[PDB]
């Protein structure tokens, strides 16, 4: 597929090949996050801070409940037939929605059945006195309640209820609640325009528990095969399925997906190396990561994906199309690969692949430790390939490295290469280039007229 020799001749040394993994088939676990601590053992030093906190929490959580009740009030069972589906929505009442919003509303309706069971023993949720409490949602299924600031109350305010003045304890509780709200509002504030969607990661949701998502995940339990890869790739998400404005808690359905490896698909990394052309230094402007799926070459938004040693883990398919010119550039037509001048002094000048060293020896002093003499790059050579057929041991300054053998052509350093057009990648320079060729095109059209 990709012509790695010609790409390496223009400074694109092939790198590690990684697999493509996408999340799928999530399992659901319900948790309760109570956003107000139990101050029953400290009520003499409560004062009026908890009423103001309750008012502030009600103001914060009212829009979330109002946005949930749009889909709560307009989704029901299908009484016509269940041959095709069993969830009936009223599209007129909802009015404007996306595919993701509709799917999330469906999932919310499915989770309503367990939310109704968790809504029982609400007095048991209101009476929790520990940071993590387990109760019985059903006779065979348990539910975990996490209280937002219960450890601070239990170990910082209650044991010092007599050693310091009660007003100081009240003030410290007030600042604790205010700091909790300050942390929470970055996530659960007006930025939570769409609480229906299930793209909210567990890290963001755990801001209602003070940022402690490790406690939630560990208490719930998980499969440890790919747990860190699932967690770091924003794949473990959650959805708010119920908000209580009397007891001040929310019910969150956490999704634990699995990682499916996309078959006959991989991602190739290209290490960029500066090369020499006409007494100047250049770097090729191509994508660093290329996704090859079923012998189809395309780009990938690797900034949203987790890159590991062996595979690239993403929560969704991030493939984007590629121009035919760049596709032809990656398959051997090096005359179509753009290049940019190097004016910075800090750029990669050599790389290693399969024990073979591709180095720009015009700009760095590469020598052979076997003989002690420097290795020469001519003015017509973009890069130098060094292996143990000509220099078994190469020194590039402070490092002496033994080299393997090249599996490509034996005439790598003698064959020529076609070089593509120079470019400039600055946004202002992009606008300037567009202006220049627009004016030139207008002049050409004026000559045509």
């Amino acid at each position: 597929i990709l012509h790695y020799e010609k790409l390496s001749k223009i400074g694109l040394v092939k790198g590690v090949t990684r697999k493509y993994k996408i999340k799928s088939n999530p399992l659901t676990k319900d948790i309760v996050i109570k956003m107000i601590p139990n101050v029953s053992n400290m009520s003499q030093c409560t004062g009026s801070v908890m009423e103001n906190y309750k008012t502030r929490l009600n103001g914060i959580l009212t829009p979330i409940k109002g946005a949930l009740e749009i889909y709560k009030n307009n989704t029901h069972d299908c009484v016509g037939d269940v041959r095709l589906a069993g969830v009936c929505m009223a599209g007129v009442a909802i009015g404007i929605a996306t595919a993701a919003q509709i799917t999330a509303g469906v999932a919310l309706y499915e989770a309503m059945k367990n939310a109704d069971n968790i809504n029982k023993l609400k007095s048991s949720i209101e009476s929790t006195n520990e940071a993590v409490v387990k109760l019985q949602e059903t006779a065979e299924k348990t539910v975990y309640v996490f209280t937002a600031l219960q450890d601070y109350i239990n170990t910082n305010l209650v044991p010092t209820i007599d050693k310091i003045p009660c007003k100081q304890t009240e003030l410290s509780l007030d600042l604790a609640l205010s700091k909790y709200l300050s942390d929470l509002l970055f996530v659960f504030g007006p930025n939570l325009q769409d609480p229906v969607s299930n793209s909210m990661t567990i890290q963001a949701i755990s801001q209602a528990f003070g940022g402690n998502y490790e406690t939630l995940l560990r208490t719930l339990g998980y499969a440890t095969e790919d747990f860190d890869d699932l967690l770091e790739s924003d794949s473990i998400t959650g959805q708010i399925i119920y908000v209580d404005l009397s007891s001040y808690y929310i019910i969150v359905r956490v999704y634990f997906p699995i990682l499916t490896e996309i078959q006959q698909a991989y991602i190739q990394e290209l290490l960029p190396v500066s090369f020499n052309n006409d007494n100047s230094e250049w770097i090729s402007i191509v994508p660093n990561f290329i996704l090859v799926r079923n012998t189809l070459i395309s780009n990938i938004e690797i900034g949203f994906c987790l890159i590991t040693k062996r595979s690239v883990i993403c929560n969704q398919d991030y493939a984007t199309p590629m121009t035919n010119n760049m596709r032809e550039c990656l398959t051997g037509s090096t005359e179509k690969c753009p290049r940019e001048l190097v004016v910075s002094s800090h750029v990669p000048r050599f790389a290693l692949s399969n024990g073979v060293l591709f180095a720009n020896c015009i700009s760095v002093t590469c020598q052979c430790q076997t003989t002690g003499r420097a290795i020469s790059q001519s003015g017509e050579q973009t890069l130098l390939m060094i292996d143990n057929t000509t220099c078994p041991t190469a020194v590039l300054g402070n490092v002496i490295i033994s080299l393997g053998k090249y599996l490509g052509s034996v005439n790598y350093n003698s064959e020529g290469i076609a070089i593509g057009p120079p470019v400039f990648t600055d946004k202002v320079d992009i606008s300037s280039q567009i202006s220049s060729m627009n004016q030139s095109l207008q002049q050409s059209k004026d000559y045509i007229k």
């Epitope: 020598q367 052979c368 003989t371 290795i375 020469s376 057929t389």
Partner: antibody, heavy 120, light 106 residues
Framework: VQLQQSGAELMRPGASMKISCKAT????????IDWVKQRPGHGLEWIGE????????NYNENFKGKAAFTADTSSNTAYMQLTSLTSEDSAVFYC??????????????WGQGTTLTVSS | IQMTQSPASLSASVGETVTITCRPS??????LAWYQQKQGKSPQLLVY???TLADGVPSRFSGSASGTQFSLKINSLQPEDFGSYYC?????????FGGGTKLEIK
Amino acid sequence: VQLQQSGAELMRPGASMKISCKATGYTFSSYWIDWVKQRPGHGLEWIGEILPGSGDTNYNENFKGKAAFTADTSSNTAYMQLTSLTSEDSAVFYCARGGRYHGQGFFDYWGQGTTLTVSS
Amino acid sequence: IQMTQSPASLSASVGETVTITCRPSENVHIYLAWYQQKQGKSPQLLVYNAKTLADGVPSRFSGSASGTQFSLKINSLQPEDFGSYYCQHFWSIPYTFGGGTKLEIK
């Protein structure tokens, strides 16, 4: 390109030599100057090499310390200094023009050879 | 890296094709040179890369590499080809010359 050596000399054991090789017709500071030994009946033997200008030197392990190399770019002359002459140093010494870079160790041009005689 | 050069001495007639081989103790790849020396004169570079002739050397001489061993061929030998022939690797430090094949015009 011509390499001109010093004349033949007779030295007592324990003395020293400063063999000179003047190079004309090319950039002296670019090409390595190699030094080769040849005693009669035992074939040629590579003494070492020096890169003039940069001062880089490479030494044969059987001759390191016994021989030293120096370069004078102003007069374009290479020098080999031999210390503690013995009966084994009675040989013909050549200065040769090596390559500039790695893999070019063949000797393009040679001097006529300075014949050293050593006797008690 | 030692050189085993064959034959140690050889006598050939005028116009006869002759071959002198030398085997390094290790693989030196392309890097090998053949020099010719006569009595009382400095050696002259005949071949500088295993199959490449030097400037001023007539096309009568030729060099060949068989991977493991290297050889020098003289076609239509002439009386001025008498002397000694040496081979050098210049692959690694120190550079090692061959034993020296003595060719005498028969």
